[PDB]
Amino acid sequence: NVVKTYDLQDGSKVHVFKDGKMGMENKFGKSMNMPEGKVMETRDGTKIIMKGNEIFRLD
Amino acid sequence: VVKTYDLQDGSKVHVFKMGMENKFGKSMNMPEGKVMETRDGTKIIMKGNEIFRLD
Ligand SMILES: [Cu+2]
Ligand SMILES: [Cu+2]
Ligand SMILES: [Cu+]
């Protein structure tokens, strides 16, 4: 049910699900609370930020 | 002006430096951390003087 996963530099992951929803886990894979309005760097060199329960990606 | 986002509320975002313009053409600061909808049916938000676009 995961359509996409952002692999973040600090070891955490954000899963985007088929249902529209979004989940985050730390480097150990335990669930995290998702920050809002906080820029997060991916391992493939992009930046994302979460807001209003949506993901925005650097332009 | 290198890039222009046309917004729903009638205003514009320019990247030249970055700034906004109301419907009347009056320039204004670029609102940080605030989501905005483009006439082309996408959403943007700016942070630390960078534009992020709905993924
Ligand atoms: Cu997982
Ligand atoms: Cu202009
Ligand atoms: Cu999130």
Q: Report the largest interatomic distance among the alpha carbons of chain B, rounded to a whole angstrom.
A: 30
User: Rounded distance, CA A18 to CA A30, Å?
Assistant: 20
Closest-CA distance of chain A to residue B35, Å: 8
User: Rounded distance, CA A42 to CA A11, Å?
Assistant: 9
Paired tokens of A4: 């996409």
- Whether B50 sits inside 8 A of A54 (CB atoms) is no
Q: Is A8 near chain B, with CB under 8 Å?
A: no
Which method was used?
Answer: X-ray
CATH of domain A1-59: 2.40.10.300
Nearest to B47 by CA among B18, B7, B8: B18
Paired tokens of A44: 């493939």
| Burial class of residue A56, CB neighbours in 10 A (0-12, 13-18, 19+) | buried
Domain range B1-55, CATH class: mainly beta
User: Rounded distance, CA B12 to CA B35, Å?
Assistant: 14
Domain locations along chain A: 1-59
Ligand 2 center from residue B7 Cα (angstroms): 12
Could you tell me the CA-to-CA distances from B22 to A5, B26, B29, B48 in Å, in that order? 37, 5, 10, 21
